[PDB]
Amino acid sequence: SVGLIWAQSTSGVIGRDGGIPWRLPEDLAHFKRLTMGHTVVMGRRTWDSLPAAHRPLPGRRNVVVTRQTGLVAHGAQVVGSLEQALSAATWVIGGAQIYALALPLANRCEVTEVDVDLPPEDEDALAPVLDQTWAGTSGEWLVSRSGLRYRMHSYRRL
Ligand SMILES: NC(=O)c1ccc[n+]([C@@H]2O[C@H](COP(=O)([O-])OP(=O)(O)OC[C@H]3O[C@@H](n4cnc5c(N)ncnc54)[C@H](OP(=O)(O)O)[C@@H]3O)[C@@H](O)[C@H]2O)c1
Ligand SMILES: CCc1nc(N)nc(N)c1OCCCOc1cccc(C[C@H](C(=O)O)C(F)F)c1
Ligand SMILES: [Br-]
Ligand SMILES: [Br-]
Ligand SMILES: [Cl-]
């Protein structure tokens, strides 16, 4: 059982300049609630992107995928491939390169869509594209306490 979870702008951007280009508290609560107690699998750049006070992610087995040798990610397990990372319920938490690896092995995608306008720039990290082999159910557009509009989508593999 492999699930992907990500937050994207409407245009499909998930990352810019080594971080996430918006702040959405309700998404962090959603992310924490869905991943707590499970293994979280991430690419090395995404590990690097975690704020120090949240690295490693507490209450979850953190697995970092890299091509480096002897990489030290304190409090995490370091592996050399996605297959190694996956040997109950496992969540792949980004970024774009690791999503692209994990999508064919996944039965579930949990997407937060953030209604901000961010035209993709050259080096952006982009969300994977889901076709009609995926069955989605969406919540309503909601307004965060901070004022940003967002909505949750849950996709299962048909
Ligand atoms: N909005 C969201 O939901 C979300 C979620 C996660 C991350 N992000 C953002 O996305 C960006 C990071 O994503 P990214 O696509 O640049 O990077 P990434 O997928 O997190 O990590 C890329 C790294 O993964 C390793 N890697 C890639 N393919 C591999 C393979 N086949 N075997 C072994 N290791 C492999 C390499 O590590 P080495 O270079 O060490 O060899 C590579 O540099 C940041 O901006 C981050 O903030 C956003
Ligand atoms: C949280 C952004 C996000 N959103 C969805 N939907 N999917 C994702 N893959 C995703 O990026 C995961 C990589 C970044 O991760 C975090 C960075 C800072 C804080 C937290 C939450 C933290 C925790 O979880 O303890 C606590 F503050 F709540 C996660
Ligand atoms: Br963030
Ligand atoms: Br926040
Ligand atoms: Cl979407």
mmCIF file of C-alpha atoms and ligand atoms in Angstrom:
data_model
loop_
_atom_site.group_PDB
_atom_site.id
_atom_site.type_symbol
_atom_site.label_atom_id
_atom_site.label_comp_id
_atom_site.label_asym_id
_atom_site.label_seq_id
_atom_site.Cartn_x
_atom_site.Cartn_y
_atom_site.Cartn_z
ATOM 1 C CA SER A 1 0.000 0.000 0.000
ATOM 2 C CA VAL A 2 1.664 3.186 -1.300
ATOM 3 C CA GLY A 3 0.110 6.643 -1.138
ATOM 4 C CA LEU A 4 1.307 9.993 -2.435
ATOM 5 C CA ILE A 5 0.436 13.217 -0.630
ATOM 6 C CA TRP A 6 1.214 16.700 -1.904
ATOM 7 C CA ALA A 7 0.029 20.301 -1.942
ATOM 8 C CA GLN A 8 -0.039 22.193 -5.235
ATOM 9 C CA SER A 9 -1.067 25.525 -6.616
ATOM 10 C CA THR A 10 -3.830 25.395 -9.228
ATOM 11 C CA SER A 11 -1.100 25.664 -11.902
ATOM 12 C CA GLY A 12 0.612 22.518 -10.557
ATOM 13 C CA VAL A 13 3.573 24.070 -8.726
ATOM 14 C CA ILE A 14 4.672 22.249 -5.569
ATOM 15 C CA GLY A 15 8.098 23.812 -4.961
ATOM 16 C CA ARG A 16 10.215 26.856 -5.758
ATOM 17 C CA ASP A 17 13.713 27.929 -4.627
ATOM 18 C CA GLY A 18 14.053 24.935 -2.300
ATOM 19 C CA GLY A 19 10.819 25.529 -0.392
ATOM 20 C CA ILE A 20 7.023 25.656 -0.717
ATOM 21 C CA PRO A 21 5.798 28.994 -2.132
ATOM 22 C CA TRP A 22 2.843 29.443 0.240
ATOM 23 C CA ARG A 23 1.874 28.957 3.876
ATOM 24 C CA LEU A 24 -1.313 27.018 4.586
ATOM 25 C CA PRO A 25 -1.747 25.910 8.240
ATOM 26 C CA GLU A 26 -4.767 23.742 7.424
ATOM 27 C CA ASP A 27 -2.649 21.781 4.926
ATOM 28 C CA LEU A 28 0.047 21.117 7.500
ATOM 29 C CA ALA A 29 -2.617 19.795 9.896
ATOM 30 C CA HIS A 30 -4.026 17.641 7.073
ATOM 31 C CA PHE A 31 -0.527 16.386 6.191
ATOM 32 C CA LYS A 32 0.313 15.576 9.812
ATOM 33 C CA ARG A 33 -3.016 13.828 10.406
ATOM 34 C CA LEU A 34 -2.683 11.580 7.359
ATOM 35 C CA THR A 35 0.997 10.645 7.808
ATOM 36 C CA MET A 36 1.333 10.297 11.609
ATOM 37 C CA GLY A 37 2.402 6.813 12.677
ATOM 38 C CA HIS A 38 3.371 5.768 9.143
ATOM 39 C CA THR A 39 6.580 5.661 7.174
ATOM 40 C CA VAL A 40 7.212 8.841 5.179
ATOM 41 C CA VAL A 41 9.436 8.564 2.093
ATOM 42 C CA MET A 42 11.070 11.649 0.593
ATOM 43 C CA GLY A 43 13.774 12.666 -1.821
ATOM 44 C CA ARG A 44 16.987 14.162 -0.481
ATOM 45 C CA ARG A 45 16.089 17.714 -1.564
ATOM 46 C CA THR A 46 12.771 17.454 0.315
ATOM 47 C CA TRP A 47 14.603 16.263 3.451
ATOM 48 C CA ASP A 48 16.865 19.314 3.041
ATOM 49 C CA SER A 49 13.752 21.479 2.730
ATOM 50 C CA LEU A 50 12.233 20.467 6.084
ATOM 51 C CA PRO A 51 12.521 23.287 8.648
ATOM 52 C CA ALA A 52 15.043 22.234 11.289
ATOM 53 C CA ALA A 53 12.482 22.098 14.122
ATOM 54 C CA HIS A 54 10.506 19.526 12.056
ATOM 55 C CA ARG A 55 13.440 17.430 10.790
ATOM 56 C CA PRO A 56 13.097 14.514 11.166
ATOM 57 C CA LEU A 57 9.275 14.534 11.072
ATOM 58 C CA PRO A 58 8.195 13.422 14.569
ATOM 59 C CA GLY A 59 6.162 10.277 15.144
ATOM 60 C CA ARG A 60 6.965 8.829 11.700
ATOM 61 C CA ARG A 61 9.727 6.682 10.285
ATOM 62 C CA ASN A 62 11.581 9.066 7.906
ATOM 63 C CA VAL A 63 13.187 7.496 4.799
ATOM 64 C CA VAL A 64 15.402 9.627 2.540
ATOM 65 C CA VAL A 65 16.163 8.586 -1.058
ATOM 66 C CA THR A 66 19.542 9.662 -2.444
ATOM 67 C CA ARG A 67 22.226 8.606 -4.888
ATOM 68 C CA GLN A 68 24.918 9.753 -2.452
ATOM 69 C CA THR A 69 27.019 7.310 -0.456
ATOM 70 C CA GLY A 70 27.274 7.563 3.311
ATOM 71 C CA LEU A 71 24.738 10.403 3.475
ATOM 72 C CA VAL A 72 23.834 11.219 7.088
ATOM 73 C CA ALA A 73 20.269 12.369 7.683
ATOM 74 C CA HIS A 74 20.057 12.360 11.463
ATOM 75 C CA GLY A 75 17.043 10.448 12.707
ATOM 76 C CA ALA A 76 16.218 9.097 9.243
ATOM 77 C CA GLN A 77 17.004 6.004 7.222
ATOM 78 C CA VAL A 78 18.951 6.632 4.007
ATOM 79 C CA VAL A 79 18.296 4.441 0.940
ATOM 80 C CA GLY A 80 19.500 4.389 -2.657
ATOM 81 C CA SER A 81 16.253 3.697 -4.513
ATOM 82 C CA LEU A 82 12.509 3.883 -4.073
ATOM 83 C CA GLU A 83 12.315 0.081 -3.993
ATOM 84 C CA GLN A 84 14.621 0.006 -0.952
ATOM 85 C CA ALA A 85 12.396 2.562 0.777
ATOM 86 C CA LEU A 86 9.359 0.272 0.423
ATOM 87 C CA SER A 87 10.630 -3.174 1.512
ATOM 88 C CA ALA A 88 1.679 -1.389 6.185
ATOM 89 C CA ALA A 89 0.695 2.056 4.851
ATOM 90 C CA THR A 90 3.546 4.114 3.373
ATOM 91 C CA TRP A 91 3.321 7.809 2.384
ATOM 92 C CA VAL A 92 5.547 9.354 -0.276
ATOM 93 C CA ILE A 93 5.811 13.021 0.646
ATOM 94 C CA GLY A 94 7.837 14.416 -2.297
ATOM 95 C CA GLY A 95 9.346 15.950 -4.085
ATOM 96 C CA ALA A 96 8.660 15.924 -7.809
ATOM 97 C CA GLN A 97 11.376 13.405 -8.710
ATOM 98 C CA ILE A 98 10.316 10.959 -6.015
ATOM 99 C CA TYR A 99 6.614 11.418 -6.893
ATOM 100 C CA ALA A 100 7.446 10.501 -10.479
ATOM 101 C CA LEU A 101 9.165 7.336 -9.248
ATOM 102 C CA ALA A 102 6.356 6.392 -6.864
ATOM 103 C CA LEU A 103 3.225 7.107 -8.928
ATOM 104 C CA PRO A 104 3.161 3.747 -10.837
ATOM 105 C CA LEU A 105 3.364 1.889 -7.494
ATOM 106 C CA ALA A 106 0.641 3.934 -5.761
ATOM 107 C CA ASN A 107 -3.037 3.276 -5.153
ATOM 108 C CA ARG A 108 -3.819 6.614 -3.486
ATOM 109 C CA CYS A 109 -3.133 10.339 -3.940
ATOM 110 C CA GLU A 110 -4.195 12.994 -1.417
ATOM 111 C CA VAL A 111 -3.904 16.443 -2.962
ATOM 112 C CA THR A 112 -4.328 19.888 -1.449
ATOM 113 C CA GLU A 113 -5.087 22.413 -4.193
ATOM 114 C CA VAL A 114 -4.192 25.985 -3.188
ATOM 115 C CA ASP A 115 -5.918 28.812 -5.062
ATOM 116 C CA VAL A 116 -2.868 30.976 -5.598
ATOM 117 C CA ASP A 117 -1.606 31.976 -9.018
ATOM 118 C CA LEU A 118 1.975 30.828 -9.616
ATOM 119 C CA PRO A 119 2.881 30.535 -13.288
ATOM 120 C CA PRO A 120 5.476 27.747 -13.493
ATOM 121 C CA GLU A 121 9.048 29.018 -13.775
ATOM 122 C CA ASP A 122 11.963 27.136 -15.275
ATOM 123 C CA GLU A 123 13.279 25.299 -12.196
ATOM 124 C CA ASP A 124 9.970 24.827 -10.305
ATOM 125 C CA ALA A 125 9.053 21.449 -8.861
ATOM 126 C CA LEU A 126 5.752 20.334 -10.412
ATOM 127 C CA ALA A 127 2.986 18.033 -9.238
ATOM 128 C CA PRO A 128 2.480 14.699 -11.006
ATOM 129 C CA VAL A 129 -0.315 14.564 -13.568
ATOM 130 C CA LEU A 130 -3.199 12.190 -12.788
ATOM 131 C CA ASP A 131 -5.206 10.729 -15.678
ATOM 132 C CA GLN A 132 -8.590 8.952 -15.670
ATOM 133 C CA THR A 133 -7.144 5.784 -14.211
ATOM 134 C CA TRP A 134 -7.605 7.824 -10.993
ATOM 135 C CA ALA A 135 -10.979 8.343 -9.282
ATOM 136 C CA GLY A 136 -11.199 11.626 -7.358
ATOM 137 C CA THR A 137 -13.569 13.012 -4.761
ATOM 138 C CA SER A 138 -13.216 16.674 -3.803
ATOM 139 C CA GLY A 139 -14.190 18.767 -0.820
ATOM 140 C CA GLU A 140 -15.588 22.256 -1.222
ATOM 141 C CA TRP A 141 -13.433 25.332 -1.670
ATOM 142 C CA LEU A 142 -12.608 26.424 1.864
ATOM 143 C CA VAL A 143 -11.157 29.665 3.216
ATOM 144 C CA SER A 144 -8.285 29.263 5.637
ATOM 145 C CA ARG A 145 -8.003 31.244 8.854
ATOM 146 C CA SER A 146 -5.218 33.137 7.047
ATOM 147 C CA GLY A 147 -7.492 33.963 4.080
ATOM 148 C CA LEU A 148 -6.139 31.652 1.355
ATOM 149 C CA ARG A 149 -8.617 29.514 -0.551
ATOM 150 C CA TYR A 150 -7.925 25.771 -0.789
ATOM 151 C CA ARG A 151 -9.623 22.419 -1.283
ATOM 152 C CA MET A 152 -8.782 18.758 -0.678
ATOM 153 C CA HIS A 153 -8.899 16.039 -3.340
ATOM 154 C CA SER A 154 -8.689 12.281 -2.668
ATOM 155 C CA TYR A 155 -7.744 10.031 -5.611
ATOM 156 C CA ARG A 156 -7.955 6.224 -5.735
ATOM 157 C CA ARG A 157 -6.703 4.063 -8.579
ATOM 158 C CA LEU A 158 -9.638 2.792 -10.655
HETATM 159 N N1 LIG B 1 4.122 21.160 -1.979
HETATM 160 C C1 LIG B 1 4.421 19.904 -1.608
HETATM 161 O O1 LIG B 1 3.564 19.081 -1.308
HETATM 162 C C2 LIG B 1 5.864 19.496 -1.585
HETATM 163 C C3 LIG B 1 6.238 18.245 -1.084
HETATM 164 C C4 LIG B 1 7.575 17.898 -1.026
HETATM 165 C C5 LIG B 1 8.523 18.785 -1.467
HETATM 166 N N2 LIG B 1 8.143 19.978 -1.972
HETATM 167 C C6 LIG B 1 9.165 20.913 -2.634
HETATM 168 O O2 LIG B 1 9.677 20.273 -3.774
HETATM 169 C C7 LIG B 1 11.069 20.644 -3.946
HETATM 170 C C8 LIG B 1 11.938 19.414 -3.860
HETATM 171 O O3 LIG B 1 11.569 18.482 -4.906
HETATM 172 P P1 LIG B 1 12.624 18.080 -6.030
HETATM 173 O O4 LIG B 1 11.892 17.395 -7.117
HETATM 174 O O5 LIG B 1 13.523 19.211 -6.345
HETATM 175 O O6 LIG B 1 13.474 16.973 -5.256
HETATM 176 P P2 LIG B 1 13.187 15.609 -4.495
HETATM 177 O O7 LIG B 1 12.329 14.673 -5.269
HETATM 178 O O8 LIG B 1 12.597 15.866 -3.081
HETATM 179 O O9 LIG B 1 14.706 15.066 -4.307
HETATM 180 C C9 LIG B 1 15.586 14.931 -5.438
HETATM 181 C C10 LIG B 1 16.737 14.045 -5.028
HETATM 182 O O10 LIG B 1 16.283 12.689 -4.834
HETATM 183 C C11 LIG B 1 17.348 11.800 -5.133
HETATM 184 N N3 LIG B 1 16.937 10.889 -6.199
HETATM 185 C C12 LIG B 1 16.187 11.184 -7.305
HETATM 186 N N4 LIG B 1 15.964 10.159 -8.094
HETATM 187 C C13 LIG B 1 16.622 9.114 -7.461
HETATM 188 C C14 LIG B 1 16.784 7.755 -7.796
HETATM 189 N N5 LIG B 1 16.260 7.185 -8.885
HETATM 190 N N6 LIG B 1 17.512 6.985 -6.957
HETATM 191 C C15 LIG B 1 18.032 7.545 -5.860
HETATM 192 N N7 LIG B 1 17.947 8.810 -5.442
HETATM 193 C C16 LIG B 1 17.226 9.548 -6.293
HETATM 194 C C17 LIG B 1 18.538 12.678 -5.507
HETATM 195 O O11 LIG B 1 19.298 12.903 -4.305
HETATM 196 P P3 LIG B 1 20.847 13.291 -4.313
HETATM 197 O O12 LIG B 1 20.952 14.567 -5.064
HETATM 198 O O13 LIG B 1 21.286 13.401 -2.886
HETATM 199 O O14 LIG B 1 21.568 12.163 -5.063
HETATM 200 C C18 LIG B 1 17.863 13.936 -6.045
HETATM 201 O O15 LIG B 1 18.657 15.118 -6.037
HETATM 202 C C19 LIG B 1 11.343 21.689 -2.867
HETATM 203 O O16 LIG B 1 10.997 22.986 -3.338
HETATM 204 C C20 LIG B 1 10.375 21.262 -1.770
HETATM 205 O O17 LIG B 1 10.114 22.329 -0.865
HETATM 206 C C21 LIG B 1 6.854 20.354 -2.023
HETATM 207 C C1 LIG B 2 3.432 20.280 4.624
HETATM 208 C C2 LIG B 2 3.576 20.533 3.099
HETATM 209 C C3 LIG B 2 3.016 19.328 2.421
HETATM 210 N N1 LIG B 2 1.684 19.241 2.375
HETATM 211 C C4 LIG B 2 1.166 18.158 1.791
HETATM 212 N N2 LIG B 2 -0.169 18.044 1.738
HETATM 213 N N3 LIG B 2 1.871 17.146 1.273
HETATM 214 C C5 LIG B 2 3.200 17.234 1.311
HETATM 215 N N4 LIG B 2 3.938 16.241 0.771
HETATM 216 C C6 LIG B 2 3.821 18.346 1.922
HETATM 217 O O1 LIG B 2 5.201 18.446 1.940
HETATM 218 C C7 LIG B 2 5.932 17.605 2.905
HETATM 219 C C8 LIG B 2 7.347 18.174 2.991
HETATM 220 C C9 LIG B 2 7.401 19.344 3.979
HETATM 221 O O2 LIG B 2 6.909 18.844 5.232
HETATM 222 C C10 LIG B 2 6.624 19.704 6.290
HETATM 223 C C11 LIG B 2 7.277 20.918 6.452
HETATM 224 C C12 LIG B 2 6.937 21.726 7.533
HETATM 225 C C13 LIG B 2 5.959 21.353 8.435
HETATM 226 C C14 LIG B 2 5.298 20.136 8.273
HETATM 227 C C15 LIG B 2 4.202 19.730 9.250
HETATM 228 C C16 LIG B 2 4.715 19.319 10.650
HETATM 229 C C17 LIG B 2 4.552 17.776 10.887
HETATM 230 O O3 LIG B 2 4.037 17.145 9.932
HETATM 231 O O4 LIG B 2 4.958 17.379 12.013
HETATM 232 C C18 LIG B 2 3.974 20.044 11.755
HETATM 233 F F1 LIG B 2 4.205 21.408 11.632
HETATM 234 F F2 LIG B 2 2.582 19.896 11.652
HETATM 235 C C19 LIG B 2 5.635 19.315 7.192
HETATM 236 BR BR BR B 3 5.723 24.754 4.544
HETATM 237 BR BR BR B 4 2.166 27.650 8.651
HETATM 238 CL CL CL B 5 -5.725 18.435 -8.910
#
